[PDB]
Amino acid sequence: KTFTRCGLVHELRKHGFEENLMRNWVCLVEHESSRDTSKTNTNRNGSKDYGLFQINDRYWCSKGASPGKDCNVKCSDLLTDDITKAAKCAKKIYKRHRFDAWYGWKNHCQGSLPDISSC
C-alpha cells in the first residue's frame, strides 16, 4: 500500500505520533520508502530494511517464523498494509536513537521540511 502525503499524516496521527514532530516523520518516510508499506531494501552487509519505516534486519525484527530482535516482531509483519506493528517499532527505535537511526532523515531532512498544512 502506498499513501498519499496526507493519507500518511492521517495514519500517523491515528497511531499517536507527536503532532509537533509530524513534518520530520513525513520527511523521513518519504525519503526512506516513498510512503510504501511494502518496500524492502537490501544493504551491503547483507541486511534488509522493511516497510514504511525501513526497519532493519540485524537489530529490530527477525527473519524467522518466531518474533524476535529488539522490537520483538517478525520482519514480515512490517510489510503489511496495516502499520500498527511497524509504528510501535518505529516509536521504539526513535525513543532510543531519536531520528539519527535513519539515513534518509539524516541527510535529506536537515534543511526544509514537507508542507503538510493541507492535511
Single-letter amino acid code for the residue at 22 = M
- Please give the Cα distance from 10 to 29 (Å, whole number): 13
Single-letter amino acid code for the residue at 89 = C
- Please give the Cα distance from 78 to 67 (Å, whole number): 12
- Please give the Cα distance from 96 to 83 (Å, whole number): 20
Give which of 99, 97, 71 is closest to 86, Cα–Cα: 71
Q: Which CATH number fits domain 1-119: 1.10.530.10, 3.40.470.10, 1.20.58.100, 1.25.40.10?
A: 1.10.530.10
Catalytic residue, from 18, 49, 77, 100: name it: 49
Catalytic residue, from 19, 32, 70, 115: name it: 32
Catalytic annotation on 32?
A: yes
First to last CA, the chain: 19
Query: In terms of C-beta distances under 8 Å and separation of at least 24 residues, what long-range contacts does 9-12 make, across chains too?
Result: 9/116, 9/119, 10/119, 11/83, 12/87
Catalytic annotation on 100?
A: no
| 11-32 core/surface letters (b: 16 or more CB in 10 A; e: else) | bbeeeebeeeebbbbbbbbbbb
Give which of 29, 24, 10, 34 is closest to 119, Cα–Cα: 10
List the resolution, Å: 2.5
- Please give the Cα distance from 114 to 119 (Å, whole number): 11
